[PDB]
Amino acid sequence: MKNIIFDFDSTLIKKESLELILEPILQKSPAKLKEIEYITNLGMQGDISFRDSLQKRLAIASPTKQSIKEFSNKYCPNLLTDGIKELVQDLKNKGFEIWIFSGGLSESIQPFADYLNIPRENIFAVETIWNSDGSFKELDNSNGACDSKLSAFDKAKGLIDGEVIAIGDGYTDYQLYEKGYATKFIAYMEHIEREKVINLSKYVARNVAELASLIM
Ligand SMILES: [Mg+2]
């Protein structure tokens, strides 16, 4: 009967996952990676829709099955926010159910969720279909995550009872509160300072101690 919803990118992990997944693919095209970063920020500032952000980034470069595995191999667990595993366990100990709603790729999140002891069934993120050669075939938006966290929450809300605290660095996290799906939004700005989102938020944390201080 109480719930924490984390974003993954720049919240549970220190960086943006899709950019890191694509960086090897784009070593010869550094401007494309800067472009992907810029588009990510437009979506996370609420300047363009999340769907438009995701589609444009995938148009710039689409990942492969193996690119996600290489990302996991390199960055799980060292890319995790300082102190996050212990915070997650402290929250579980205090009775919170932990969820991840993200615009990152679900397959990239799973190893991290495993490490953090967050159930796999509690991850509502961007699902991908690969061709038999590992290349990108298409998104699978059955869960709504390719449109927004709002759509994903709407589809999943029968599984979520009671208070919901949304924690994240982006406008899409704020939207969960705006729409009333979350009872509280805490802007998480350890890794990035998003002025538009900070300005909308009543609560801001810049490390896991500050975050704990706002919740427990
Ligand atoms: Mg984020």
Instruction: Tell me: is residue 140 an annotated ligand-binding position.
Output: no
Of 161, 167, 170, 182, nearest to 214 (Cα)? 167
149 and 61 in a single domain? The answer is no
Ligand 1 centroid to residue 11 C-alpha, Å: 6
Question: How many other C-beta atoms can be found within 10 angstroms of the C-beta atom of residue 94?
Answer: 12
Residue bearing tokens 């919803």: 5
* 123-130 vs 136-140, strand pairing mode: antiparallel
Q: In degrees rounded to 5, what are phi and psi of residue 34?
A: -65, -35
Ligand 1 centroid to residue 170 C-alpha, Å: 5
86 and 11 in a single domain? The answer is yes
Q: In degrees rounded to 5, what are phi and psi of residue 29?
A: -125, 70
53 and 87 in a single domain? The answer is no
129 and 187 in a single domain? The answer is yes
82 and 70 in a single domain? The answer is no
List all residues 6 or more positions away from 47 whose beta carbon is below 8 Å from its beta carbon: none
Residue 117's domain spans which residues?
Answer: 2-16+77-215
Of 41, 91, 83, nearest to 197 (Cα)? 41
Ligand 1 centroid to residue 9 C-alpha, Å: 4
Ligand 1 centroid to residue 167 C-alpha, Å: 9
Ligand 1 centroid to residue 161 C-alpha, Å: 24
Ligand 1 centroid to residue 5 C-alpha, Å: 12
Ligand 1 centroid to residue 132 C-alpha, Å: 30
Q: How far is Cα 48 from Cα 26, in angstroms, rounded to an integer? A: 24
| Domain at 209, CATH number | 3.40.50.1000
Ligand 1 centroid to residue 8 C-alpha, Å: 6
105 and 122 in a single domain? The answer is yes
- Exposure pattern of 27-41 as b/e (b: 16+ CB <10 Å)? eeeeebbebbeebbb
92 and 165 in a single domain? The answer is yes
Instruction: Tell me: is residue 90 an annotated ligand-binding position.
Output: no
Ligand 1 centroid to residue 138 C-alpha, Å: 22
Q: How far is Cα 9 from Cα 100, in angstroms, rounded to an integer? A: 10
Structural domain tally of the chain? 2
104 and 205 in a single domain? The answer is yes
The structure tokens listed for 174 are: 């704020």
Instruction: Tell me: is residue 173 an annotated ligand-binding position.
Output: no
Question: How many other C-beta atoms can be found within 10 angstroms of the C-beta atom of residue 154?
Answer: 14
Of 181, 142, 169, 158, nearest to 43 (Cα)? 169
3-state secondary structure the chain: CEEEEECHHHHHECCCHHHHHHCCCCCCCHHHHHHHHHHHHHHHCCCCCHHHHHHHHHHHCCCEHHHHHHHHHHHCCCCECCCHHHHHHHHHHCCCEEEEEEEEEHHHHHHHHHHHCCCHHHEEEEEEEECCCCEEEEEEHHHCCCCCHHHHHHHHHHHCCCEEEEEECCHHHHHHHHCCCCCEEEEECCCCCCHHHHHHCCEEECCHHHHHHHHC
Q: How far is Cα 50 from Cα 44, in angstroms, rounded to an integer? A: 8
Last residue of a domain, one of 39, 59, 76: 76
